[PDB]
Symmetry: D2
Subunit: 347 residues, 4 copies
């Protein structure tokens, strides 16, 4: 089968012709119908994941097939597989744990001590087929097609968990920063579907502000036009917001938005940008605010976003389909921030 | 009555002879049998509270009587007081809310938008009598005397809430920083009394290390003689700790102890020291750590620490009793870090 | 002023001409614009409340003006009232506590040991004016008029708390029993506005099933046509539901719907009907199900329902307006189950 | 190897000579050094487990080796086992899941839809060797030996979870019913080690009342000699208890102790006795009480109890060692309630 792989850091991905693994035991062989490409793969093609080394830290033994956003049809099931048959359309949770460590035992497998992340330190979906280590990481699609689902396994689970960490309820207000981008609109949609909280989206372009409104925000702010802190204060009648979700935070967002926090406000940071949080400690204790990080999500988060998306309660990302051969191209566009829409590789 | 009051910023407290207020409605006049003095009174005699101005921010109309650590016998009760009688020995929760704002409605009264903090922006216990705005803020002492209880209304409630925010259970490990000082040993005792978590105490002098161990720590570390991070790494088998309670944090502690956090770990900061939190953002997202602030506590936290103490499950702070007149003196020793043990004024 | 009061048990309410109280301190005098009437008032005109005696248990000193569903305009404010002004239209939370008991301290005021329930053991809104003990129990109306808001102070808060007790999230499914009734549709609307859970509504007539569908149920079951437990199994792929909300339970609902629960499922029961819960203990332990009671709610619950309603996120109850003098008739209609919609008296 | 097995329902267990399975993949073959025996095995020797049929319900293809309380040294590890070596002394969590169902995904593996319960529907520890389906279900013993640890896999995890379900804190009071039996003293110790709550222990013979007191109960009551309800109301000053943990409830306990519940009290039921819960529904709603079932526990509960025990924070159950050959004998003893102390078979 054809597979686009990381054979050497720095160097572009390489198309190879490798053997189609044979599924044994709980394993499932999936014929890939969609392989999402995201910013992570930009930093992945450079041998890193945030600031770790896939080789030194995650134990990657190059070459490795990339692609951690996976949906497709079951081609074959191992002999121990239960509850799935050839022909089933599924999405796959790639953030897999080994089972024995503390995080696996308490059901937070994505924080596993020795992670098995598909497409990061194990072969992924940039190929005609992909082995899923255990059938329990799958979700049968009934309403969504593969292209619609694949991005949910990464951006969907990430934003779903970030919304959960914002601890929202009907008495609260949420601020979503960068609310008109891919991640932002998804966070707005999920917060709207799952919380009852008032949702405020802030962005910096008229088009992105409109996308935030279309995604369901109750209020939107164009920070290039209005002082955002003053508009947040006006909307919340000087209370501030009870949570901020800052997806792909930057040095700028971290310096501005914590000031919009109400007492006990939670500032949820998502992403891997090389920026530092700088905050006056007394301001933290006096207001009991919290700064909390989030990345990807666990099996319950996967269940949650998949259930929302399958019920149509949240919508698929704006998508651009491309062929496998275009993998490097797709990633280049993400480097030059020339990727308008989630790129998904299709057969 | 006699009353030591902050009549002018900078200038030392003044011993005045003002009248004894008359208790009306749900108010309660307490004859002070113990007024604690703590570090906050040092930064108080300087017209501030962390970085605010009791006058401009907390609306303090000087002169204002200090003393937010209160315990005494009821002298007289308003006509709407129920369940308390003249003579009753009580401790008082000074962190009072007005009831109408968001924070009062959800039961977080200490975070009230228009706080009524006894001894901070309302007349405190640095006097012979003190008015408690509402009887519900009192707790009937049965086992403890005024001197032992008075510190609990500040240090006890503060550390009780900090332990709750650590979100501890038996599967977890807590690090208490400064574990051998006044606040540190209380935190250790409370954590040992209420969570079942493994408790590590760290301090910098052999004497403080012994006090932490005597307060119940499972493991104690002397950071002057050992590398706390290496010790913690082995105690937790490289996982790190699930919470750090940093009472009276500094630029130094904030720069060291966050590195001890396990994934999902909570760094609970308590106090008003002029230090800034500096932390690389990707470290926060990758490990899902949380920096959480905490100060004083609500009516539930007061009930909790008083119940523990009355049942002897947590012991009174080490105290040195003095006279009302020695107020300015008491606050001096705190300024010059010459005060060993909680100073308690006895009118 | 005119006031319809319970001057004797059994005997029908009595229209009296009493004096308009004077508001002092934190008290607020409201000019009633809407006094909701509900089933509770049936069991109230009979000196009871579930199984208690308002006189013996709640300390009711007859005569007492009924009316616990209250909205109107501020006529006058006590001298200590802050944040409200004459002419403000407000809804009132009647489930008030005294503040000192355990439940009040932990923020569960409706479960107070010495409750101050307006319209129950204190003068309520079946009159031209009503005294609210403390202004903090009010909520300013902007979107809603008094008639729309009054029922929310009872059915709204009750149902909102029931939904919170069901512990819903996007990975779960809820069953609302009697989903087409006034309380049932409110529960469906709230669950849809606040949770992300999949919602199944069940009722027993075609028109009721339609009402549940309009309220927002994802699935509906006509139990007069299909076996409801089998249909719930089909919908949930044999898992059962993670919660049941059974508002105004009967002997019939309690004998059938707990069987629909998934493992760990919560059966939230609301109401005072004289029925017994009857269930085989081993089934409870084997499935870890929970039976949980709920009645009315606290300040946070009131905040939540008013915020949803004021934002239009949940709709007001179908209402029939009547005159104060018709109070007895209104209650009669509830006894003869000839009441269509929530009856609201307008003085 | 020697293996006592349930070859036919009704008929007593049969000592057989079966081969020692070979551990493949993630499996681990353990050399049993302790096989606890508890009441469940009595109810098991009768093909049942509460009321089910291990064959019909749990898919038990007889003969099946009993023994769900497992501890011993690792004889051999599969080729996929990490973190454990031949020679390691371990305790085993028998309440295992398959991974794919909702309950496994959310980390509640004991509630798995297709449970793999060692000693119940999978071969247990009544043998010289036993296969563990996956190494993650193990815990390395450091301070405990096999005999001390094996019972924890059942009574320890069960009571640990019951205590968590009681939702305790320092402001609360817990009643443990059957407080002086093996399960009861474990529950008391755990509540004392992990909750801060005041503990009332009730039992029905003086020797058991004394054992409850030695286990940590603050108050103890002999329900044989004194009205337990009057005594509880005296101790709690009429508030009632905030939780009851009813270990091996009976028709008697369930008809009595719910009456001792405070408002919001949680009644935690543990066990499989043939009794019905009968309770007036209005009492449930008026007081917001909860009846909640609890059975065994999940991976996090197992981690918690093993941590407590390995730290000496709770003590091993009183045990009586016997030989594999006496399996039927031990179960007989439990049938005739002639068994004093947890019987542990040592092949
Ligand atoms: Zn991705
Ligand atoms: Zn792991
Ligand atoms: Zn203090
Ligand atoms: Zn307030
Ligand atoms: Zn009502
Ligand atoms: Zn109360
Ligand atoms: Zn057992
Ligand atoms: Zn399962």
């Amino acid at each position: 089968m054809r597979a686009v792989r990381l054979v050497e850091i720095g160097k572009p991905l390489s198309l190879q012709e490798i053997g189609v693994p044979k599924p044994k035991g709980p394993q499932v062989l999936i014929k890939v119908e969609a392989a999402g490409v995201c910013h992570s793969d930009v930093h992945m093609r450079q041998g890193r994941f945030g600031n770790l080394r896939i080789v030194e830290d995650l134990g990657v033994k190059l070459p490795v097939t990339l692609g951690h956003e996976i949906a497709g049809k079951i081609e074959e099931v191992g002999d121990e597989v239960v509850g799935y048959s050839k022909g089933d359309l599924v999405a796959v949770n790639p953030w897999q744990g080994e089972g024995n460590c503390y995080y696996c035992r308490i059901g937070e497998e994505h924080l596993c001590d020795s992670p098995r992340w598909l497409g990061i330190n194990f072969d992924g979906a940039y190929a005609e087929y992909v082995i899923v280590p255990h059938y329990k990481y799958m979700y049968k699609l009934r309403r969504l097609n593969a292209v619609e689902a694949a991005p949910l396994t990464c951006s969907g689970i990430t934003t779903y968990r970030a919304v959960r960490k914002a601890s929202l309820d009907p008495t609260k207000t949420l601020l979503v920063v960068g609310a008109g981008g891919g991640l932002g609109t998804m966070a707005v949609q999920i917060a709207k579907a799952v919380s009852g909280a008032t949702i405020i989206g802030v962005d910096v372009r008229e088009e992105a502000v409109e996308a935030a409104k279309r995604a369901g925000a109750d209020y939107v702010i164009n920070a290039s036009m209005q002082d955002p802190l003053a508009e947040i204060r006006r909307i919340t009648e000087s209370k501030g917001v009870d949570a901020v979700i800052d997806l792909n935070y930057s040095e700028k967002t971290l310096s501005v938005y914590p000031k919009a926090l109400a007492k006990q406000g939670k500032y949820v940071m998502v992403g891997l940008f090389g920026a530092d949080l700088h905050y006056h400690a007394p301001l933290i204790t006096l207001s009991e605010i919290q700064f909390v990080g989030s990345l990807v999500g666990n099996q319950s988060d996967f269940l949650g976003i998949m259930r929302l998306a399958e019920a149509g309660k949240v919508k698929p990302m704006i998508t651009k389909t491309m062929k496998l051969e275009e993998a490097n191209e797709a990633i280049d566009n993400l480097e030059n921030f020339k990727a308008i829409g989630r790129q998904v590789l299709i057969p």
